[PDB]
Paper text:
The cryo-EM map of K. pneumoniae Amn was determined from images collected on a Titan Krios equipped with a Falcon III detector to an estimated resolution of 3.03 Å. Ab initio models confirmed the D3 symmetry expected from the homologous crystal structures, and all further refinement and model building enforced this symmetry in the interest of improving resolution and mitigating the moderate orientation bias of the sample. The map lacks density for the first seven residues of the protein, as well as presumptive loops at residues 61–79, 156–166, 362–365, and 468–478, but otherwise possesses the features expected at the estimated resolution, including clear density for side chains. The active site is composed of residues from two chains; a cleft of conserved residues in one chain binds the nucleobase and sugar of the adenosine analog, with H188 and Y189 of the apposed chain contributing to stabilize the charged phosphate group. In the apo structure as determined, the core residues expected to stabilize the nucleobase and sugar (N205, W383, M404, E405, and D428) are well positioned to do so, whereas R381 and K436 are in alternative conformations in the absence of the interacting phosphate. The surrounding residues are well resolved; weak density outward from the active site is interpreted as residues 435–443, possibly stabilizing the apo protein while remaining flexible enough to permit AMP access. The cryo-EM structure of K. pneumoniae Amn primarily differs from the apo homologs in its loop regions away from the active site, either by lacking density for the loop entirely or being in a clearly different conformation. Notably, the loop covering the active site is strongly conserved, suggesting an important role in protein activity, ligand gating or structural stabilization, despite its weak density.
Whereas eukaryotes can deaminate AMP to inosine monophosphate, prokaryotes cleave the adenine base from the ribose 5-phosphate moiety via AMP nucleosidase (Amn, EC 3.2.2.4), additionally salvaging adenine. In K. pneumoniae, AMP is broken down into adenine and ribose 5-phosphate by the enzyme AMP nucleosidase (Amn). The protein comprises a well-resolved C-terminal hexameric core consisting of an extensive β-sheet structure surrounded by α-helices, and a somewhat less ordered ancillary N-terminal domain, dominated by a long α-helix,forming trimeric layers on each side of the core.
Numbering used by the authors:
A (entry chain A), B (entry chain B), C (entry chain F): 8 to 61, 80 to 155, 167 to 361, 366 to 467, 479 to 484
Write the structure that this text describes.
Amino acid sequence: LTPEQALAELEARYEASVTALRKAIGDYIDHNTLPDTEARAEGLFVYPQLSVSWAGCYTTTITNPKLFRNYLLEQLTLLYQDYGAHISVELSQHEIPYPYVIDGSTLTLDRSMSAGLTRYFPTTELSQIGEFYPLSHFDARRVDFSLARLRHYTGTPAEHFQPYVLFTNYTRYVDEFVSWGCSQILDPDSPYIALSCAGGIWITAETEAPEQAISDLAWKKHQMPAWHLITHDGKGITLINIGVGPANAKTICDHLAVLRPDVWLMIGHCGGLRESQAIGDYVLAHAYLRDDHVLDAVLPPDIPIPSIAEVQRALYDATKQVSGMVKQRLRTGTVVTTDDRNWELRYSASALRFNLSRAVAIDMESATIAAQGYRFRVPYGTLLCVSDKPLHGEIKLPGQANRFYEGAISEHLQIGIRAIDLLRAEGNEPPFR
Amino acid sequence: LTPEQALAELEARYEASVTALRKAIGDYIDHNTLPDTEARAEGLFVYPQLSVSWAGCYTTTITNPKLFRNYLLEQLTLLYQDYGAHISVELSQHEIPYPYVIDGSTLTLDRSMSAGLTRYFPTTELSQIGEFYPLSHFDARRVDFSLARLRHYTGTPAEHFQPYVLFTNYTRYVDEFVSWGCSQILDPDSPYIALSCAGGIWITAETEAPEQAISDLAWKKHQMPAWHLITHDGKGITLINIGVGPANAKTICDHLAVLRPDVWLMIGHCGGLRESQAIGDYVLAHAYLRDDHVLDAVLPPDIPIPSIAEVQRALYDATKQVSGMVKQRLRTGTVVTTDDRNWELRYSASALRFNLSRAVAIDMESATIAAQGYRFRVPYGTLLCVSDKPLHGEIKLPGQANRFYEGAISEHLQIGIRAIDLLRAEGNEPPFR
Amino acid sequence: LTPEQALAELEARYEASVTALRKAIGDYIDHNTLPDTEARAEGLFVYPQLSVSWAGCYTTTITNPKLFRNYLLEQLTLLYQDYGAHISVELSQHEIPYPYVIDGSTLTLDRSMSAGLTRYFPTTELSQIGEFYPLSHFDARRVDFSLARLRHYTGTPAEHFQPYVLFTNYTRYVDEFVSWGCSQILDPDSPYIALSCAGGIWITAETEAPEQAISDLAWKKHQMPAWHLITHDGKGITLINIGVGPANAKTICDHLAVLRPDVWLMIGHCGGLRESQAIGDYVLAHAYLRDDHVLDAVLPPDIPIPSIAEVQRALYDATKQVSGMVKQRLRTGTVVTTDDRNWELRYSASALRFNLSRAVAIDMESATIAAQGYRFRVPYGTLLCVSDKPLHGEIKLPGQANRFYEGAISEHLQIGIRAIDLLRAEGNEPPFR
């Protein structure tokens, strides 16, 4: 089959199933009626299934054909002009849980109606989330489970996310990014055409008020707000403010992997461990020592996490170009990651390991992001800036009086954006990439 | 010595030392002059030291005699009427780091001045923070290290904290508490006389505007805001919004232990694990299964963490009185604590342990607070409310559409406050309690 | 002191002490006489000691000033024109064991004389091998312990070793290297002037017979023969045939580190693990998975072993230039190292790890050499060539009928030598490098 037919059929089947389930819920609520157990067994509430045969056959269940349109289309056409494969679209035996299809009702229901919904209708089973080979990394019951939480943690629809992701932990970066984006949109000759903020704000070049992009209500309701800078093609920039901790940088990566991004970058601040370092110097990681106890059950510390040559070259070039000069202000080394925000009180232990690995800086998130980008096959990077010297009696705090690190906050972000630009300019494994 | 003399001498010595250090910094900045190494060796920049002899002698260095006045006074008078002890006050050989005494200058200094300050003046050494026996749990260099971060994480001065602490993780509780406090202050016959909010807002009964207590800027700048409801005696209520995670509930406890509170209470929501539980039911913990990897290096999981009979009795009585009825809406059991926000994806492992311990609920903070209250000898409690049923297909999210858990948010807080009231109504170990 | 005076004094003191000990042994053997315990306590049998003061003072005992002449001289002059330091030379309190000074006698002694030598003369104590800071990595009692075994394992004097070391495991490489060197020496315009073979053979351009360099008696007596290609300056090439196993590649590195080489290169063959690989393709390592149980007590597997950018760039350039074409014949990946020569019989276990690390090849020595070059601060590299496909039913043996891997043995060595040439063309830490 030509891929266009497959896409159209998938969309039609998914729409029919969702509409049927919505109407069944509606008339059960409003008339106390149950659905037949025979017609429902005719694949009435089931996900569409796609299979390609070329050695063997690979089948998976698709969950949102209208959101993954470009990715699915290019992956299907890449296996239709270079190999010999047959494409089949049919109905599966897995059912759509009802909490995922609520977009036209208001469940102001008492306990009896909730019990009836739980009893007579499909629900989520934890034994499910986790012709004989898988075609993609994830099935439908996991992608749909993750898309429901992306909209809750972040605050923006999942249709807006862009392929180049930046992570921060300091709100001044957010202010700088919003200002720079609002300045760039007004430029007549620029790819960007719109800005989407957390909370449901859509700013274009024809809005009377540009002074509501950064409101204080966003940090009230959403744990990890995100700002997207849309492009006409679909190649923009996304900024996510994860926070502080190695457990908040793992869940967001888990939920964000299902969109298949193109690159993850980390931009933050650390604390130097070498006497030659001065506040305001850049650190580039080429190896990570993992002291965060998360991910030790699925990826043991014996497994080595390498670096990616292309990303490091891009970061070095961007630093050289933007800084306008770098053998003394930029270092390359091993960064430590810990889940203990008060490691000083136990320093006398950690010191031993800090000597065996010849570490250069310490932070709290980079190793977890690198591990998650290794597990899900996403390119990753890191570029940190020294904010204090804990071991040499110049210890400071993020947000307090610091006139040398606050100066280099509007230039660190420029280095990150230039790295993204340079990366974009150039260019048992499941067959989908 | 009578304790009054000891208190006066401690205050005078501390004030003299702080003033001397401040003036030395000032004239070094403004005239490029250094201090003598001989007069400075006359105990010019040193903490006062207090010793009591009664078997043996105990000595510690005091850091802020005017903040710990009541505690020190009662502890010293309790050892002067029941034992035979001699009290001595002198000068120690430990020096006051300069970052702790900056309250009258503005260090808009370049790199040269910062280097000079680091070289010619006392600084923080990490080998220090961690007549022959200790008189208190902590020395001065640790109390002063913690008081500097209490003011940064929270946003309020350390002189306002109250002895009865409530922990939450859901901002609706904060809104309810602020409203109830502002309503209580206006009552002519009530112990409370003022409210102190995060960010530096002081509300009394004679303020024109009571509509600025809860602003959205607090969540922008401070990670863990706190609201205090002051009382004339010093017996009020403190509310702290720690957040989500087992690593944010450990650092705040580390920094808050040095004020010697009277009780820590935890008020939040969990996810039920038993089929008989309905959304809106109360869970009371009598044992904790610790799956959070923090604190496993200083308190191994073999050590048992018991419960406190007085606190559990108070919580049961408060629930019975406020709820106005409890053998079916209230359960007692074992709660699990995990650092993985997506445990469902790995459920098939954890299930085994969930069967061996006969668990009743799952949450993310209670076990760490209980362990920290065990280490520092502070009474602790816990009272959770079921918000979803993950294993039985009724899984929900905090902040989403939930009309049965949002109803019992103005009554859960009342149960907590009544428990605090009931607890207040009644009533190698260092000699200080 | 000017460094020349220090060198002359060190040489004179060492020569005097060695001569005194030799004569004492001689006259004890030939006349049954003992040495005085008072004159001997005048520093009569002691190592010279060198100290430099510049912050603090560093002292170490020198063992062979006439062999380390250039290294010591340049390190001492580098600290005399860039810093302020004072140089002192004196006598230490450590004694020279007699087994290290036997170069003029023949101990055809019975048991009585051996017992007398052990009793009345200094001997080796195992508590010793393993003004207040160390000036170099090793002291005299360890350097002298290692120089005695370099001459036994290898078969050549320690004065001939060159700074650029190549490791092999296949004797055909040795034959090719000997032939190429003997051809290069005869060239009138070439840096090389002599060849030194294992067993004590010295070949120059004026020898009648060039057909005795490669004799079969070398493999009889010496475990790890080495061939040196001397240069007039001191910049030549050394080839060492370590053998097979991860325990023979660790002891030779231990003993060879004390000469401070400039680069270690590994050249061997592996077994591919990817279906796209064909026999005769090159693998370049950028991360090592360590399954050899040696070195797990001094460098745990948690510590990451990075790669060196300069060496990898040189290897890539050399492959591109020599091969005369490389995106398909050259791969970059993770190599596994194991101490089990029959891993196939247990494959069903190792497979799991082979999937977590995305490995590309398997060998038996590279990871140990990389770890040893990390511990002693020596640059390291690796370039392997595929010889069989164990997992895809093309398994072969080294030395058996293989007409595609035997062709690329005279070109692999050329790539290694070109890499050495390119590296030479360009260009709590002890102060000596």
